[PDB]
Structure formats: structure tokens, C-alpha cells
Amino acid sequence: SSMEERHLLLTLAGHWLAQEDVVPLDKLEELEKQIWLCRITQHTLGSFDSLASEFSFSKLAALNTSKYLELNSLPSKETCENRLDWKEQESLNFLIGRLLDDGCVHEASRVCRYFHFYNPDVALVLHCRALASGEASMEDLHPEIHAEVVTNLEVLTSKCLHGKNYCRQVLCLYDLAKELGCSYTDVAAQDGEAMLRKILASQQPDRCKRAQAFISTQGLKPDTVAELVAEEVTRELLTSSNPTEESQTFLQLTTLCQDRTLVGMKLLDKISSVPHGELSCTTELLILAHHCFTLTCHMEGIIRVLQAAHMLTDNHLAPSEEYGLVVRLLTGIGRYNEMTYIFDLLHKKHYFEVLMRKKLDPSGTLKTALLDYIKRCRPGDSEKHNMIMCREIGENHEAAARIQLKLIES
Amino acid sequence: LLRRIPDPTMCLEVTEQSLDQHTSLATSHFLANYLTTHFYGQLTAVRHREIQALYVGSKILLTLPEQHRASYSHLSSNPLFMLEQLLMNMKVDWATVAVQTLQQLLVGQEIGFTMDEVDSLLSRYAEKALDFPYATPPARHQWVPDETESICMVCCREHFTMFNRRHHCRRCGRLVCSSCSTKKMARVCDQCYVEWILDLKEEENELVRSEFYYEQAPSASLCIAILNLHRDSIACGHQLIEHCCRLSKGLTNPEVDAGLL
Numbered sequence: 001s002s003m004e005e006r007h008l009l010l011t012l013a014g015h016w017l018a019q020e021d022v023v024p025l026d027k028l029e030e031l032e033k034q035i036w037l038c039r040i041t042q043h044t045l046g047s048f049d050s051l052a053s054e055f056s057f058s059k060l061a062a063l064n065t066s067k068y069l070e071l072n073s074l075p076s077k078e079t080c081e082n083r084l085d086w087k088e089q090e091s092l093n094f095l096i097g098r099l100l101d102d103g104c105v106h107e108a109s110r111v112c113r114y115f116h117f118y119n120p121d122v123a124l125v126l127h128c129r130a131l132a133s134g135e136a137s138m139e140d141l142h143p144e145i146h147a148e149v150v151t152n153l154e155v156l157t158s159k160c161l162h163g164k165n166y167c168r169q170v171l172c173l174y175d176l177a178k179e180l181g182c183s184y185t186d187v188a189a190q191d192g193e194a195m196l197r198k199i200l201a202s203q204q205p206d207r208c209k210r211a212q213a214f215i216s217t218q219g220l221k222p223d224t225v226a227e228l229v230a231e232e233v234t235r236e237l238l239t240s241s242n243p244t245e246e247s248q249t250f251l252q253l254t255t256l257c258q259d260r261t262l263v264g265m266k267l268l269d270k271i272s273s274v275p276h277g278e279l280s281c282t283t284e285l286l287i288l289a290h291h292c293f294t295l296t297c298h299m300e301g302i303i304r305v306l307q308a309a310h311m312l313t314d315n316h317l318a319p320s321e322e323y324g325l326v327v328r329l330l331t332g333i334g335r336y337n338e339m340t341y342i343f344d345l346l347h348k349k350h351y352f353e354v355l356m357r358k359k360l361d362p363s364g365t366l367k368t369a370l371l372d373y374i375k376r377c378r379p380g381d382s383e384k385h386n387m388i389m390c391r392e393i394g395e396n397h398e399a400a401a402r403i404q405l406k407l408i409e410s
Numbered sequence: 411l412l413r414r415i416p417d418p419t420m421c422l423e424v425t426e427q428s429l430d431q432h433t434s435l436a437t438s439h440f441l442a443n444y445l446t447t448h449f450y451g452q453l454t455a456v457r458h459r460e461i462q463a464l465y466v467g468s469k470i471l472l473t474l475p476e477q478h479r480a481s482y483s484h485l486s487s488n489p490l491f492m493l494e495q496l497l498m499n500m501k502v503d504w505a506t507v508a509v510q511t512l513q514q515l516l517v518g519q520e521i522g523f524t525m526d527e528v529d530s531l532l533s534r535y536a537e538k539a540l541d542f543p544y545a546t547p548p549a550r551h552q553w554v555p556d557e558t559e560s561i562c563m564v565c566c567r568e569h570f571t572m573f574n575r576r577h578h579c580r581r582c583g584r585l586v587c588s589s590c591s592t593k594k595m596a597r598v599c600d601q602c603y604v605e606w607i608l609d610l611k612e613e614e615n616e617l618v619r620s621e622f623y624y625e626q627a628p629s630a631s632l633c634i635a636i637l638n639l640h641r642d643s644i645a646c647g648h649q650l651i652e653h654c655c656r657l658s659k660g661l662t663n664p665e666v667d668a669g670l671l
Contacts, residue, residue: 047472294670296631297629297670298626298629299572299573299575299626299627299628299629300625300626300627302573303573303574303575306573306574307589335573335667337667338571338573338574340567340568340569341567
């Protein structure tokens with residue numbers, strides 16, 4: 001714990017030191033160097049750290065200066081000073097792996113300037129951090145770094161054995177800049193959620209795959225993604241404010257999600273955002289709820305969905321009298337096995353013979369359900385039966401004939 | 411105050427009598443090592459085991475999210491009950507860390523909570539988990555039978571089905587539709603008329619273990635997640651097949667959605 005206690009006190013020092021008005025940044029530079037060295041020594045020899053972070057200034061603001069990412073911010077490859085030990089630099093690269101996973105661009109460069117370690121991984125890292133703006137000529141880069149926006153995003157993109165997420169975000173920014181048409185600085189200032197939402201409104205033909213790729217690239221948070229998706233769906237529906245053709249336009253949006261259940265939750269929540277008189281778009285909106293919840297089968301979710309469907313039928317559709325929209329919804333019931341709320345209504349709504357509409361059974365299930373309804377819901381009117389089991393009719397006629405035959409024999 | 415003990419017996423007696431009096435988080439976290447300081451073997455009893463019972467239970471409760479830490483002190487010193495409670499809130503993902511911690515921390519931890527007890531816990535959990543429904547508040551017998559009212563006892567519109575399910579009301583005991591009885595407090599509606607909260611005591615513990623019906627109907631996902639935790643893999647698969655066979659016969663019944671079934 002001597003190394004651990006040393007780290008604790010070392011981190012404690014900056015906690016007060018920051019409170020000072022004029023921070024002797026250079027004086028604490030040795031402190032940060034010592035803190036990192038203590039971390040490395042602990043690794044080599046390999047709540048406390050909780051409180052340490054609780055007062056840690058590893059992310060000290062002015063410590064993360066932009067000039068820490070200057071043109072030669074790292075020592076060159078030939079500037080690989082032989083001050084390291086056998087496994088010290090190895091554990092240093094080990095932690096630096098989490099660092100590149102951590103992604104603190106300024107902090108890593110500050111450590112390197114302090115530690116004077118020539119990880120060529122960091123060399124390409126410093127190459128790319130400013131190559132995001134392409135601020136230096138390609139020939140002007142280092143002898144190992146001197147050797148078409150994506151030319152930089154893929155010249156040695158895979159060469160990053162670790163920290164590939166850096167090049168991933170690099171290409172993400174490259175594509176974003178090429179698309180929107182703004183400089184590196186203007187793009188880099190917009191919020192991640194805002195930029196994603198801006199992508200959401202995009203209706204370019206092939207921008208869907210690139211945008212989804214960039215959404216993977218940002219890697220911010222799933223729930224925000226789901227919120228953005230629900231907002232985009234609502235916006236597209238409001239704009240829209242064949243029937244089998246737009247199903248793909250609908251679904252491919254939900255495809256952007258990671259696991260569809262959270263998207264279903266978000267869509268169900270956004271369904272309450274229906275506008276005043278929003279009926280036609282909201283019909284498809286409600287329709288999407290089943291197409292989402294069914295493929296994963298969250299029974300309670302589907303239960304609330306069925307409640308929502310009955311509510312749409314009664315609160316709105318019953319006053320709306322939209323016969324065609326209701327018919328399409330009933331077709332899209334999915335659990336049309338459980339459509340008792342309008343089952344007798346269709347017959348009462350003069351749909352009984354209208355149930356014989358052609359081209360409405362692409363899979364043939366509508367006519368089968370019509371036969372089921374003729375068997376159960378409305379038995380007796382064989383005319384609608386012919387319009388829509390002939391074995392059931394044969395059995396009934398045979399029973400009537402047998403009854404007539406037995407009446408005489410009685 | 412500790413050093414000012416009157417007699418040597420008094421120091422040990424106070425140290426022992428203290429812990430059991432509804433301790434506090436830091437209170438335990440200190441008094442434990444405090445009794446450790448100079449007692450060693452002075453009263454082994456079940457005392458050493460009890461000390462261990464938090465000696466790792468702290469680390470157990472010490473793997474969750476910051477906001478999640480708050481309710482973790484509700485039972486942070488009954489580790490056996492703690493794992494089950496962790497299972498209770500449907501909070502699967504949090505379990506995996508606890509399982510790894512227990513396995514890495516079993517290291518001779520003579521605390522009774524041997525991993526076999528853990529396997530029993532998990533098995534019982536899963537059995538409950540994939541389990542498929544297949545003037546005064548009324549009593550259990552006074553609850554209306556599920557097959558008594560084909561339509562809802564209140565809504566009277568949706569028939570009893572796997573998807574079209576219902577619940578038992580808390581006011582008159584009728585089979586009132588949750589849609590018709592969406593409130594929580596003759597046959598009157600709930601409006602007309604929830605994770606585990608564990609404790610040190612076993613009475614309400616039994617009440618909840620007999621009550622905490624995971625309202626989410628039987629969605630294999632939860633079952634697979636829960637099962638993937640214990641170690642009896644072949645036995646796990648046998649349990650899976652057995653539960654499958656248990657499910658099988660229900661199909662011919664007419665109150666289920668056969669397709670999704």
C-alpha cells in the first residue's frame with residue numbers, strides 16, 4: 001500500500017492545489033508525472049482510488065491544453081529516450097491501451113510529453129488528431145508518418161493495433177464533414193446527440209448505411225439513440241401527414257437499433273405525441289408497435305399494445321368512422337385471433353359481403369380468418385360463407401337429413 | 411471511549427453486544443475491524459462466521475452503480491439473501507459481477523453460503539422465472555376463480571387468455587381486468603374501491619418469496635439469462651428440457667396463443 005498510499009497523497013496534493021488562484025502549472029507538472037510514475041510502479045509490482053477520483057484532477061482543464069496537441073507534441077521516434085525499464089514501458093502500453101480506450105486526447109499527449117515515451121501507436125494517434133483538420137501536408141509528416149478525404153481515414157487505419165476507435169471516430173468526422181459541408185472546427189463543436197439528430201432528418205438515398213455506421217462510431221449511449229429514432233419516426237410520419245411498399249421504409253429505420261425492445265419502449269412512449277387530428281400517420285404509427293413488440297415477444301408489452309389498439313378503435317376510430325383505415329388495422333392486428341371488438345362490427349358495418357374484397361389476401365390468411373368468423377362469430381348465413389368449411393356445411397346438411405329421416409321412424 | 415473500558419471482560423462484552431443493534435453502514439464497516447483489533451480468539455462461537463458474513467458481503471454490495479448502492483444496505487449483511495434479492499429485481503446484468511465475485515471470493519470462505527447453496531438459489535429462481543401461467547379486502551379463498559368468469563369480472567370484455575390475461579383485484583377479490591382496475595391502494599374496481607425490499611428477518615422474507623410473482627409473463631429471455639449463471643451446465647440443460655416438457659402439454663388448452671406459444 002506504500003505505492004498506493006503514495007498515489008493517494010499525490011492525488012490529494014492537486015485537490016488543494018487546484019483551489020489556488022494562480023496555479024503554478026509547471027510545479028504540478030512534476031506532480032502529475034510522479035502520479036503517473038507511481039501508477040506505472042504499482043503496475044510493475046502487480047474507497048481509496050474512489051476518494052482519489054473524488055478529488056482527482058487528472059482531467060485538469062488547463063492541463064488539457066490544445067497546444068499539448070501541437071505539430072510536434074510528441075517526441076519523435078528517434079526521440080525514444082532509453083529511460084524505461086524491461087516491463088515498465090510494457091505496462092505503460094497496457095494502461096495506454098485503456099487510455100486510447102479512454103479517449104482523452106489531450107491527457108495522453110500530456111503524459112507522453114511528461115513521460116517521453118515513443119509508442120508509434122501514439123505517433124499515428126498524434127498524426128490523426130490533427131489530420132482531422134489535415135493541418136499538415138502529407139509529405140510534411142514524420143518519416144514513419146509522412147507515408148480523397150478517406151485517404152487519411154484508411155492509409156494505415158488498421159495499423160492501430162490498439163486504439164482503433166480513434167481512427168473510427170476519425171473516419172466518422174471525415175464522412176460527416178464531407179457530407180454536411182463544413183470545416184473540421186465547426187463540425188467538431190456540435191454535440192453528438194445534435195449531430196446524430198441532424199443525421200436523422202437526412203433523406204439521402206444511401207446515407208442510411210453511412211449514418212448507421214457513424215452512429216456506431218459515436219458509441220455514446222443506446223437510450224439516446226432510441227429517443228432519436230422515435231423522434232425521427234415521428235418527424236417522417238408528420239411529413240407524410242403502396243401500403244405494402246412503405247413497410248420497408250418503416251422497418252429499415254428500426255433496423256438502426258441495437259436491441260429492438262428499447263426501441264419499442266421509445267415508440268410506445270412517443271405514440272402519445274399524436275397531433276390534433278393526427279389519424280392517418282398515427283395509424284401506421286400504432287401499426288408499427290405490433291411489428292416491433294411481436295418479434296421479441298414481451299407479453300406484457302403486447303398486452304399494453306392490445307389495450308392501445310382497443311383504445312385506438314374506441315376513443316378515435318369509433319368517432320373517426322374511417323372504414324378503410326380500420327380494415328387495414330384489423331388486417332394488421334397480428335393478434336387478429338383476438339379481434340372481438342369489431343368482429344361483429346364488420347358484419348354490422350356492411351363488411352360481411354365486403355369481406356370478399358379481392359387482392360386483400362396476399363398470404364391467404366384474411367380469407368381463412370373470414371372462414372373462421374363464418375364458423376364462429378356469424379354462423380347461419382351461408383351466402384357470406386360462399387362469398388368468403390364446406391365439410392361443416394356437408395355435416396350440417398347430413399345431420400338435417402338424418403333428423404328428417406329419423407322423425408318418420410320415431 | 412473504547413480505551414476507557416472498566417474491565418477486560420467489559421471491552422469484549424461491549425464489542426460483542428454492539429454489532430447486533432441495527433448497525434449502520436460505516437458503523438459496521440468500522441466496528442468490524444474494531445472487534446478485529448484485539449480479540450482474535452476470545453469468543454469464536456458463530457461469531458467468526460458472522461464477522462465473515464459481512465467480511466465479503468461488503469465487497470458484494472460494493473459492485474453496483476452509485477445510485478444502486480442506496481437500497482443495497484437494506485440487507486447488505488445477509489449475503490445469501492443478498493444474491494437472491496439481486497435476482498429479484500429482474501436486474502439480471504448486475505448479477506454476473508456478483509457471481510464472479512462469489513466464485514473468486516469463495517476462497518475458503520467458511521460462511522455456509524457454499525456455491526451449492528447458490529446453485530439451489532439459481533435453480534429455484536429459474537423455476538419461478540420461466541414458470542408459465544398455464545366491505546373488506548377479500549381473502550385468498552374469496553378470490554374469484556380464474557375460470558369462473560369467462561369475461562372479466564369488471565371489464566367483462568376481454569376473455570381470459572395468455573395474451574388476454576387478467577389479475578386478482580385487492581378490493582373484492584374478483585377477477586378484475588388490470589385495464590379496468592389500473593389503480594393501486596360489492597365488486598368494485600381498484601379505483602372505484604415493487605421490487606424486493608429485503609430485511610434481516612425471515613417472516614416477511616417468506617411472505618415475499620411466496621408473493622413476488624414476476625408479473626412479466628414467461629419470456630424465455632429471462633430464463634436463459636438466469637440459467638446462464640449457475641455452474642451445473644449439463645444439469646442446467648436437463649432442467650431446461652424438463653421445463654420444456656412441462657410446457658408441452660399446455661398447448662391443447664384453448665386459452666393460449668398457439669403461434670407465439
